[PDB]
A = this chain, B = another copy of it.
């Protein structure tokens, strides 16, 4: 069973659902967490979808070394300046020291692009579309939260290089739309497509696109993924040059993109869909979609091998119709134990089979998201359970998206922007775009915060500039700072 309440102490609710669903085990190194098979299967389900899609775009999988030299890491000046204090350095091999300290990748820009330069000698070498599934290390000192904020995490990073800027800009939106599919269609989480501000953009690129999700339990938003257009800032430092047949002599630099998505996906899935009973898995990423457990001392041993065979009969039928099913035929656990054990893990459907239900050619089907039981005939298991599982996926998303539509509004002044901020909601406001003004928003929001006992206050930072804002910017509408005119509607709010 679960003890902590989600509506009150969300932090303790989160630490108990990730451990009692057997997803996360803690490690003696702070910030590093063990991804148990239950959580890792979700990442592999995300991997199977995203891998099959980038290959359609012409992207191939590879693996680059995790260690970066000093000179290679410092070629891009501003890119290394943002990641510098967050880089873990290897300075000794056992007892003997290293002649040159090597760095662990916080990202593989400075690792791949020296190789991109050698691979690009003419126009026939482009485009290059490479992706890798690996781990990276960012030793940020902020308080770590499993899945969401970890010193080491798993991700994919795709790095593409084009001779054209139109080809590169086209890929940025293509990948970001795939990221939205990962959250909306696999995790049943609505996201807001948008562009990062100049303060929050990827240091070293021209612009950064992103998807932002909302967690109503804490009133905080979180970035689900990013797709950057690096322009030529890396091609001009790493000399990824080529000769154009139309214009010769002038050394042309390649246009590059970089896009990443991490295991944070699993943490957002926990915060959005989880309840006070435990985890709640979307059926499209659930390791097992339907769990089968026999229900119901003096019973003869002949009929004991009969109902477990119907369980194996159900398990085998669902596998032919492509439904991930587990048969919990373990006898050392009580039926009530495995009841809470599997809804703590969040399996979308629990299949119950009592002795009387078996003889009556029927079985019970309990839903995880709502708890509704349904006595189903034994000839309806393949077509109806598939219809129930798909109904789980849509209601989790329609509830989460109705939860987001309610919690995302518009405000045109600090009085409204701050008031609705204390309402545990995010809000799009007219923004001038200046960086120092964005610091002023994050300052006067934590300064004038109307909080409640139990919830700390943090300044509202920028999240994204939505491609499709709620309402259009009025002609001549000034920014909320008053000292500068507004350039666009910008989504703000407290963030993870």
Chain A residues close to B by CB (< 8 Å)? 25, 27-29, 32-37, 40-41, 43-44, 60-69, 71-72, 84-96, 101-102, 104, 111, 114-115, 118-119, 124, 130, 134-135, 137, 139, 141, 151-152, 154, 332-333
Interface pair B90/A28, CB less than 8 Å apart: no
Chain B residues within 8 Å of A91, by CB: 89-92
A94 touches B139 (CB 8 A): yes
Q: Is the CB of A65 within 8 A of B29?
A: yes
Which residue in chain B gives the minimum CB-CB distance to A43? B63
B154 touches A63 (CB 8 A): yes
Q: Are B63 and A90 in contact (CB under 8 A)?
A: no
Of B62, B137, B152, the residue contacting A34 (CB under 8 A) is B62
Per the bound structure, the CA–CA distance linking A239 and B139 in Å amounts to 31
B85 near A96 (CB under 8 angstroms)? yes
A114 partner, pick from B28, B40, B61, beta carbons under 8 A: B28
Task: Give the chain B neighbours of A66 by CB distance below 8 A.
Answer: 32, 135, 137, 152
- CB contact under 8 A between A64 and B332, given known A84-B94, A102-B88: no
Q: How far is the CA of A470 from the CA of B27 in the complex (A)?
A: 48
Can you list 19 residue pairs at the A/B interface with Cβ under 8 Å? Answer: A25-B118, A27-B111, A27-B115, A28-B71, A29-B69, A34-B62, A34-B63, A40-B61, A40-B62, A66-B137, A85-B95, A86-B94, A89-B93, A90-B90, A92-B101, A93-B139, A93-B141, A124-B332, A124-B333
Q: In the complex, what residues of B have CB within 8 A of residue A64's CB?
A: 27, 34-35
Taken together as a complex, chains A and B put the C-alpha atoms of A61 and B35 apart, in Å, by: 9
Q: Given A25-B118, A96-B85, A135-B66, A104–B124 Cβ distance below 8 Å?
A: no
Known: A37-B61, A84-B95, A90-B104. A69 touches B115 (CB 8 A): no
| A93 contact set on B, CB distance < 8 A | 85-89, 139, 141
Q: Which of B29, B41, B87, B88 contacts A68 (CB 8 A)?
A: B29
Say whether B65 contacts A37, CB under 8 Å.
no
Contacts A28-B72, A87-B93, A124-B332 known; 8 new A-B pairs at CB < 8 A = A27-B65, A27-B111, A28-B71, A37-B61, A66-B137, A84-B94, A90-B91, A91-B91
* Nearest B residue (CB) for A91: B91
Residues of B within 8 A of A40 (CB): 60-63
Whole-angstrom CA separation of A66 from B137 in the bound complex: 10
User: Of the candidates B28, B33, B72, B87, which one forms a contact with A94 in the assembled complex, judged by CB atoms under 8 Å apart?
Assistant: B87
Q: How far is the CA of A68 from the CA of B32 in the complex (A)?
A: 10
Q: For the complex, what is the distance from the CA of A124 to the CA of B118, rounded to whole Å?
A: 56
Measured between alpha carbons, how far is A29 from B111 in the docked complex, in Å? 10
Q: A28 contacts which chain B residues (CB < 8 A)? A: 69, 71-72, 114
Q: Are A65 and B32 neighbours in the complex by a CB distance under 8 Å?
A: yes
The answer to whether B94 and A85 touch across the interface, beta carbons within 8 angstroms, is yes
Please name the residue on chain B nearest to A65 by beta carbon. Answer: B32
B37 touches A102 (CB 8 A): no
Chain B neighbourhood of A27, CB < 8 A? 64-65, 67, 111, 115
What residues of B have a CB within 8 angstroms of the CB of A119 in the complex?
Answer: 25
Residues on B with beta carbons closer than 8 Å to the beta carbon of A86: 93-94
Contacts of A29 in B (CB 8 A): 65, 67-69, 102
Chain B: which residue is nearest A93 at the CB level?
Answer: B139
Residues of B within 8 A of A63 (CB): 34-35, 40, 43, 135, 154
Query: Which of B37, B44, B92, B152 sits near A89, CB closer than 8 Å?
Result: B92
A33 to B, closest residue via Cβ: B65
A154 to B60, CA, bound (A): 18
Check B61 against A44 for contact (C-beta < 8 Å): yes
- Whole-angstrom CA separation of A111 from B67 in the bound complex: 21
CB distance from A107 to the nearest CB of B (A): 14
Minimum CB distance partner of A89 in chain B: B92
Q: Are A37 and B60 in contact (CB under 8 A)?
A: yes
Contact A32 to B67, CB < 8 A, known contacts A89-B93, A94-B87, A134-B135? yes
What is the CB-to-nearest-CB distance from A123 to chain B, in angstroms, rounded to a whole number?
8
Which of A93, A119, A135 lies at the interface centre, i.e. has the most chain B CB atoms within 10 A of its CB? A93
For A22, give the chain B residue with the smallest CB separation: B119
**Interchain CA distance A119-B111 in the complex, whole Å:** 38
